[PDB]
Amino acid sequence: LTNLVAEPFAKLEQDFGGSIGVYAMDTGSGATVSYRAEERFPLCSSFKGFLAAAVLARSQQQAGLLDTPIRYGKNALVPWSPISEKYLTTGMTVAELSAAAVQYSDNAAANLLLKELGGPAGLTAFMRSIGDTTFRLDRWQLELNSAIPGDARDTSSPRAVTESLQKLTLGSALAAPQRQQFVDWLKGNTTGNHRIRAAVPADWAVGDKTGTCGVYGTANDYAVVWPTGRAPIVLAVYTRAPNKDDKHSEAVIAAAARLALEGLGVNG
Ligand SMILES: *C(=O)[C@@H](NC(=O)[C@H](N)c1ccccc1)[C@@H]1N[C@@H](C(=O)O)C(C)(C)S1
């Protein structure tokens, strides 16, 4: 049921000047679209969705975790921290940091939450615990964005991202209240309007998390999509390019998502 219908991903990545990795899953029939799906690509900020899921998992065992206030000093503010910078003088709750990391890709909030989980190895351990043997986080923001060609640190594959996203949003990896909260955070994301969402009709529900490393044409998005009248679709789109100063493209991510949906026979 893989690639029942061929799509021109090769021409798309050639026009972009890099590599594109795609894995899309129709959760009803099990049919898939797959292109470079088992290659490693840098996560960039897309790790933060899984970080929020790991926080929610912990909260099943710590009833008070989400409401815990976290205070932080100016030395915790990283470039691109649009929410946490407004609460420096007050603090934010764990739930609010999680929402900011997912929905604004707030870099300081993500580092604070990583600390709570025991750092990159603690997030990697959570992904191992849901059966993902590919994902690895090695460093913190912003060093994890280096996107060096051939470097396996801070990478996963489009396929493993999609498989883990499915387990967390639709499967049994989180208890039902935490599952819906993860979904609601993804649905409220603000940074993805020009990526997978641009290929999804306005009358369908969707949640996503983006990543943009800033170098090596490296950027990405993953999403769960609920077309009306059929089962949901889970997909991941990752890009990279050979030269440090190659620019990323939002349009190429949207175009790859359109091809994935066409390949699954989802009318959009
Ligand atoms: C994670 O990927 C973060 N990326 C960065 O901080 C980069 N230094 C950067 C690249 C391009 C423009 C500004 C910063 C954050 N997540 C990105 C995303 O979710 O697409 C981001 C651009 C919102 S910042």
Side-chain angles (χ1 to χ4, degrees):
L1 294 183
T2 311
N3 298 326
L4 289 166
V5 170
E7 300 290 341
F9 290 110
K11 187 59 170 194
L12 185 67
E13 81 188 341
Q14 286 165 24
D15 289 347
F16 167 65
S19 303
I20 299 167
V22 178
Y23 191 82
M25 179 194 303
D26 183 337
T27 65
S29 65
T32 59
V33 167
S34 176
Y35 186 79
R36 299 191 188 277
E38 298 87 17
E39 297 183 24
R40 285 182 176 281
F41 291 79
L43 290 161
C44 317
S45 287
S46 74
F47 80 92
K48 299 166 190 177
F50 298 118
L51 179 62
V55 170
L56 287 168
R58 179 170 287 190
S59 77
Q60 302 177 194
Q61 255 39 71
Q62 307 179 9
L65 174 60
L66 292 189
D67 287 318
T68 295
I70 303 304
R71 307 184 42 232
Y72 49 93
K74 192 175 164 185
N75 57 339
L77 287 179
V78 180
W80 305 288
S81 297
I83 308 299
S84 55
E85 75 184 11
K86 307 305 177 196
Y87 299 85
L88 177 63
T89 56
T90 68
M92 301 174 56
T93 67
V94 169
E96 287 178 319
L97 292 168
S98 297
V102 172
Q103 302 178 327
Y104 291 88
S105 214
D106 193 290
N107 281 325
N111 275 351
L112 288 165
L113 290 173
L114 254 185
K115 188 63 176 170
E116 287 283 313
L117 286 181
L123 181 56
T124 300
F126 171 71
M127 300 296 286
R128 294 291 178 272
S129 83
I130 66 171
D132 184 331
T133 55
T134 306
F135 179 105
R136 59 184 290 181
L137 204 74
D138 296 82
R139 288 171 300 169
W140 305 71
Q141 276 287 148
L142 304 157
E143 288 89 357
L144 68 80
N145 293 322
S146 49
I148 293 165
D151 186 353
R153 292 178 296 173
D154 308 296
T155 63
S156 193
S157 68
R159 176 173 189 158
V161 170
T162 296
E163 289 170 340
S164 290
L165 187 62
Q166 178 179 1
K167 292 166 183 179
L168 292 164
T169 61
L170 298 176
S172 60
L174 296 170
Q178 285 73 22
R179 179 186 314 145
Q180 187 61 235
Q181 181 64 88
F182 184 44
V183 166
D184 289 347
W185 282 339
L186 292 166
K187 283 186 166 190
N189 178 36
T190 74
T191 66
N193 293 342
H194 305 295
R195 297 181 188 193
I196 292 165
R197 281 170 191 266
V200 173
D203 68 317
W204 301 358
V206 48
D208 82 297
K209 177 75 195 83
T210 55
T212 309
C213 277
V215 287
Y216 290 105
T218 299
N220 54 61
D221 196 21
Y222 57 71
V224 182
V225 176
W226 289 264
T228 67
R230 62 183 297 160
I233 308 311
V234 187
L235 73 166
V237 178
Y238 282 69
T239 75
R240 66 174 128 74
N243 301 314
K244 190 170 188 178
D245 73 347
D246 284 340
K247 276 312 305 154
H248 74 280
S249 173
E250 303 207 274
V252 174
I253 292 170
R258 286 193 200 92
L259 289 183
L261 295 172
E262 289 177 22
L264 292 177
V266 180
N267 184 62

